[PDB]
Structures are given as C-alpha cells and as structure tokens.
Amino acid sequence: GEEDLCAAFNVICDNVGKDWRRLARQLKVSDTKIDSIEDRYPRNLTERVRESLRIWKNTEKENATVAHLVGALRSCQMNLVADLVQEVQQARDLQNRSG
C-alpha cells in the first residue's frame, strides 16, 4: 500500500526521465497540472516525475495500485522500468512473510 507505492515511485523517479510527460498522460494527469509541474520544478527532471505520481496517488486514494502503475508504464513502452517495478514489488511481497 503506502510503502509499496514509495518503493515503486523511487524506482520510477530515477529511471524515467526524457518522456515523463508521456507517462503523466497515461496516469490521467491533466495538461493543466502537467504545465504547472514544468513550472514548479524546472531544475530537476526526477523531481518533476515524482510530483506527477504524487498527484496520481491523490487522484485515487483507494485505487492507486502498483498494478496500475505498471500498466501505465507498459502503455508508454517503458517496459524495462515496468519490469523493475514489478520485481521490486514481488521482492517486497516475499519479505512481509519472512521479515
């Protein structure tokens, strides 16, 4: 839930970069908001990606799932990132029981 989405965000933030606007669009983040993200954080590309995700999490309290993050990523051909997010999530699933 909470910590899982953090883990996903941390992976996505530091690995998306150039085509982040494409991803924002898939997460149904309005252009009105994407314009303002470009304004708020002109310095760091990684900070822009994070805020994009934060808006998306606030946009669905209960429905903001890692499964749907992975769909988003795959629809933008960001498949290697999707893969990594899935594997990290899977790893986390297997620790809850042991750790």
Binding site: C6, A7, N10, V11, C13, D14, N15, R43, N44, T46, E47, R50, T65, V66, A67, V70, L80, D83, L84, Q86, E87, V88, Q89, Q90, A91, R92, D93, L94, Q95, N96, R97
Partner: protein, 115 residues
C-alpha cells in the same frame, strides 16, 4: 539539486530487497572488483545496510542503462523465483501432509504474488 537524493532513495529501495551476500554476488558479477568490495566492507563494519547501498552505488556508476536494467532485472527475477519456489514448496508439503483442512492455501499463494 535532488539528483543524488533521488538516486539514493532508489538505490536504498533496491538494497532493501536484496541480502548483503546477494548484493555482493551481483556487483561482483557486474564489474565491482574484490578490491572495491573490501574497501566498502571496512568503511561500514557496523552498518550492513549502508554496505549494500555503497556497493550498489559503485555498481550503478559503471554501466549503460540497457545493461544496468537487464542485469539487475534478471538478478531480481531469479532471486524472486527461487524464494517463491521455496515458499510454495513449504506450503504444499505442509498441506499435503496435514490431516486438517487447509482452506488457507489459495490465500497463501495469492499473498506471495500480491501486486
């Protein structure tokens, strides 16, 4: 400005889903020589968590994205598959050897694969 914070958050996340020996194994296979490992090992004798992060940090700053991805993903996939195999084997042997009902089996399997 935040490049290194976000790189740190990311690498910490990966570190948290690997054991110290697993990280040592991985970076050894992908260009971090036993020199750098020992230098890192003695800089954090108490802090095994930081060992993993420095190890991954050193590995990360050595590789093209396509290579970093493929290798790390492959490494996590195999470790996940092994741990699934062990955990599912235990549930199945436990249940197959029990006399009681195990209405929990489906739920057990489902949790292992939660996403």
């Amino acid at each position: 400005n935040l490049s290194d914070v976000d790189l740190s958050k990311y690498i910490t996340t990966i570190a948290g889903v690997m054991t110290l020996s697993q990280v040592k194994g991985f970076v050894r296979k992908n260009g971090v020589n036993e020199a750098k490992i020992d230098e890192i090992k003695n800089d954090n004798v108490q802090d095994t968590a930081e060992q993993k992060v420095q190890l991954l940090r050193n590995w990360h700053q050595l590789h093209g994205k396509k290579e970093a991805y493929d290798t790390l993903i492959k490494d996590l996939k195999k470790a996940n598959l092994c741990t699934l195999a062990e955990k599912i084997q235990t549930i199945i042997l436990k249940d197959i050897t029990s006399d009681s009902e195990n209405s929990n089996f489906r739920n057990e399997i489902q949790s292992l694969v939660l996403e």
